[PDB]
Amino acid sequence: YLLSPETIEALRKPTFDVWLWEPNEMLSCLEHMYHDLGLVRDFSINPVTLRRWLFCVHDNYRNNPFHNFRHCFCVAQMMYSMVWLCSLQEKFSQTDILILMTAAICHDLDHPGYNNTYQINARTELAVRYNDISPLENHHCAVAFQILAEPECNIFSNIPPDGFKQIRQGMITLILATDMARHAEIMDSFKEKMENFDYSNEEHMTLLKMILIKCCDISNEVRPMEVAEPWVDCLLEEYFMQSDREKSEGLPVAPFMDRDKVTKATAQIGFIKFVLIPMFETVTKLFPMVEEIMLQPLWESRDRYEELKRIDDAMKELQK
Amino acid sequence: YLLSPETIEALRKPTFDVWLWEPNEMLSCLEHMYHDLGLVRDFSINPVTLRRWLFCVHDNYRNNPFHNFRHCFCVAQMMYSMVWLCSLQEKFSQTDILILMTAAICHDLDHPGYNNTYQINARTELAVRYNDISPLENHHCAVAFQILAEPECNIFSNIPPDGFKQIRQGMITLILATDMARHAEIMDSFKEKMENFDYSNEEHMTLLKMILIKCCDISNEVRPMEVAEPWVDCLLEEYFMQSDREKSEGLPVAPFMDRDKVTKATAQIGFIKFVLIPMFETVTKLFPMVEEIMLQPLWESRDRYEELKRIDDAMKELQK
Numbered sequence: 266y267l268l269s270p271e272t273i274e275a276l277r278k279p280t281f282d283v284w285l286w287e288p289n290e291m292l293s294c295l296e297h298m299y300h301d302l303g304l305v306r307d308f309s310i311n312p313v314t315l316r317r318w319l320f321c322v323h324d325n326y327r328n329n330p331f332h333n334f335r336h337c338f339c340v341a342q343m344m345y346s347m348v349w350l351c352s353l354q355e356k357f358s359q360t361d362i363l364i365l366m367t368a369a370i371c372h373d374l375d376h377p378g379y380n381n382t383y384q385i386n387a388r389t390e391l392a393v394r395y396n397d398i399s400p401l402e403n404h405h406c407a408v409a410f411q412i413l414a415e416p417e418c419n420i421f422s423n424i425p426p427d428g429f430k431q432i433r434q435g436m437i438t439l440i441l442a443t444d445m446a447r448h449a450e451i452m453d454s455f456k457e458k459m460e461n462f463d464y465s466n467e468e469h470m471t472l473l474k475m476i477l478i479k480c481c482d483i484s485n486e487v488r489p490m491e492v493a494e495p496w497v498d499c500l501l502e503e504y505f506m507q508s509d510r511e512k513s514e515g516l517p518v519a520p521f522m523d524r525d526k527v528t529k530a531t532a533q534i535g536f537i538k539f540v541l542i543p544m545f546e547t548v549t550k551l552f553p554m555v556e557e558i559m560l561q562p563l564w565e566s567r568d569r570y571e572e573l574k575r576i577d578d579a580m581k582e583l584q585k
Numbered sequence: 586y587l588l589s590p591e592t593i594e595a596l597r598k599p600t601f602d603v604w605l606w607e608p609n610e611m612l613s614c615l616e617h618m619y620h621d622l623g624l625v626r627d628f629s630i631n632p633v634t635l636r637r638w639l640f641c642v643h644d645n646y647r648n649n650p651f652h653n654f655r656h657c658f659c660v661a662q663m664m665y666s667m668v669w670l671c672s673l674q675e676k677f678s679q680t681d682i683l684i685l686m687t688a689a690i691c692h693d694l695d696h697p698g699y700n701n702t703y704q705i706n707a708r709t710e711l712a713v714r715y716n717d718i719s720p721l722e723n724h725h726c727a728v729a730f731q732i733l734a735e736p737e738c739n740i741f742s743n744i745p746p747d748g749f750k751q752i753r754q755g756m757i758t759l760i761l762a763t764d765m766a767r768h769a770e771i772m773d774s775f776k777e778k779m780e781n782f783d784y785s786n787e788e789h790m791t792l793l794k795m796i797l798i799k800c801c802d803i804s805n806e807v808r809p810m811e812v813a814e815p816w817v818d819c820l821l822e823e824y825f826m827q828s829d830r831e832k833s834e835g836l837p838v839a840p841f842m843d844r845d846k847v848t849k850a851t852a853q854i855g856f857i858k859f860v861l862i863p864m865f866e867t868v869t870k871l872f873p874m875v876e877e878i879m880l881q882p883l884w885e886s887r888d889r890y891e892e893l894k895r896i897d898d899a900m901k902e903l904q905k
């Protein structure tokens with residue numbers, strides 16, 4: 266739990282290998298980030314509270330194949346990478362940086378392993394509790410502030426009330442923004458503002474922060490093929506658990522979750538080409554350095570999966 | 586326990602004296618409304634479940650001076666009056682009517698007597714659960730469907746799932762629409778659609794139903810003076826209870842809830858001229874009969890409060 270200076274240097278890049286570490290180790294990396302970004306400094310975060318809070322946050326993540334503490338670490342680490350790559354401290358206030366990192370760490374708190382569609386279709390407590398309005402994201406966010414409501418885990422204890430309101434409002438906006446059901450909507454608002462972006466316009470900045478946490482949340486394919494690939498299997502593993510249960514309970518099943526229809530290759534080709542690449546393209550208009558560091562590996566991921574599908578076709582064709 | 590034909594007859598007019606009845610008589614009036622509007626008939630509502638349900642609903646309303654079961658009966662009874670006054674059954678499907686009546690009855694379920702501003706500023710469990718997004722309305726709605734989730738109270742048990750979904754979505758929209766913080770937004774949207782209203786445009790109808798339930802929710806002043814006045818004192822009783830708690834907790838207090846600034850007269854004059862009259866005025870442009878049966882008493886109510894203000898100001902000079 267004493268990060269070597271080599272690790273501290275690789276922790277700033279999207280190439281970081283998130284699979285090599287264990288909870289304890291990742292917990293230290295996260296702790297490092299808060300000190301390194303000077304958040305501990307500028308918000309008078311009690312360095313000890315920060316430690317408890319991170320274990321507080323860790324305990325509240327479930328052992329799902331995909332939506333687990335490691336996913337949370339990936340998102341926070343990718344966010345951390347982007348703060349350096351795009352020199353976000355020259356554009357954002359320390360408050361926004363805090364919002365971005367805290368939102369990233371807490372965005373999937375207590376995820377059950379079944380998406381909103383299952384919650385809504387099965388009429389779960391979450392769905393009824395949140396009236397079908399992004400039940401999961403709402404829950405994550407609620408769990409996050411319940412944690413910050415425990416004095417022992419309140420890393421925000423030394424922030425004036427005016428600041429807390431601005432931080433809370435910001436985190437809520439960003440966590441709720443990760444519901445993919447809003448992807449098209451958010452992307453449009455953003456592409457619009459982009460026609461004439463203005464870092465002084467508060468709405469532009471909010472959309473930008475919304476886009477940033479969205480990129481980090483689904484940025485797995487931006488990492489090296491060795492690091493990125495296993496995440497797809499973790500996600501499908503979780504999805505199949507849902508589809509089986511849905512089939513069992515007689516609830517509708519989404520095609521991309523049906524073993525007999527989804528193939529890693531075909532799935533990732535469309536995800537990369539129509540969701541990932543386009544989103545990061547919009548961001549590269551503000552941060553050109555992104556094209557080389559994040560779009561590049563995304564183009565390689567796309568091509569790799571396209572070639573990987575030709576192999577699947579030729580192979581299945583060969584069997585019939 | 587039974588209703589007289591005179592009562593049943595009067596139940597159709599906004600002049601109905603809602604104070605003359607006890608829970609069991611109100612439950613019976615509500616019951617009659619469902620049979621009379623053809624909702625029991627068109628949705629195969631088990632007549633026994635209808636009564637059980639009305640009871641589950643009653644049991645879940647709290648004994649607040651204002652936000653209690655009688656208030657919910659006021660809203661439902663006014664909605665009922667409007668269905669007749671504006672001949673709503675010629676413009677609305679029976680599903681729309683069901684949504685309107687059931688939403689009006691369930692719109693304030695389990696209200697605590699302290700509004701959203703208190704919830705948010707005091708960081709209560711509700712404001713945390715719903716991330717400061719219309720926490721109360723979200724809660725009322727969830728209780729309504731928790732109630733409907735108990736087979737014995739489920740008046741929708743014989744409605745196919747597609748219908749339930751459409752009714753659920755409709756009820757959620759209407760209940761969340763009662764949060765006055767959204768009053769300006771909704772009125773603007775509606776007035777925009779009013780530039781060329783279209784009864785066949787779905788977005789047009791959703792807004793009209795939102796306006797309708799909002800009209801019923803804050804319509805106390807449309808009723809005869811003797812029936813309306815006591816509600817104002819009831820609301821204020823609840824409001825002072827909040828501002829008292831707010832001052833002795835360090836939380837800000839709403840000027841209109843401030844014992845030292847709010848006078849029944851001044852408050853109602855404003856509420857009547859800048860909220861009520863304007864809202865019913867734009868509604869009248871769609872339903873002409875509304876001007877005489879509802880806009881008229883509101884004008885009277887306004888004039889009476891303006892006179893009461895002069896008297897009030899005089900006596901308060903002396904109390905000094």
Ligand SMILES: C[C@@H](Cc1nc(=O)c2cnn(-c3ccccc3Cl)c2[nH]1)C(F)(F)F
Binds near residue numbers: 500501504
């Ligand atoms: C593998 C899925 C598509 C997909 N690919 C990703 O890399 C990725 C990363 N996150 N993420 C995701 C996770 C949870 C919810 C929504 C999304 Cl979008 C992803 N979804 C499937 F099966 F092909 F649809």
Ligand SMILES: C[C@@H](Cc1nc(=O)c2cnn(-c3ccccc3Cl)c2[nH]1)C(F)(F)F
Binds near residue numbers: 804805806847
């Ligand atoms: C007396 C209040 C104004 C007011 N007058 C009403 O007749 C009325 C009816 N409902 N309603 C109301 C009730 C709950 C929440 C919001 C409103 Cl708007 C009302 N608020 C006060 F003190 F002047 F602000």
Ligand SMILES: [Mg+2]
Binds near residue numbers: 372373443
């Ligand atoms: Mg999520």
Ligand SMILES: [Mg+2]
Binds near residue numbers: 692693721722763
């Ligand atoms: Mg209410």
Ligand SMILES: [Zn+2]
Binds near residue numbers: 336340443
């Ligand atoms: Zn996530």
Ligand SMILES: [Zn+2]
Binds near residue numbers: 656692693763802
């Ligand atoms: Zn109400």
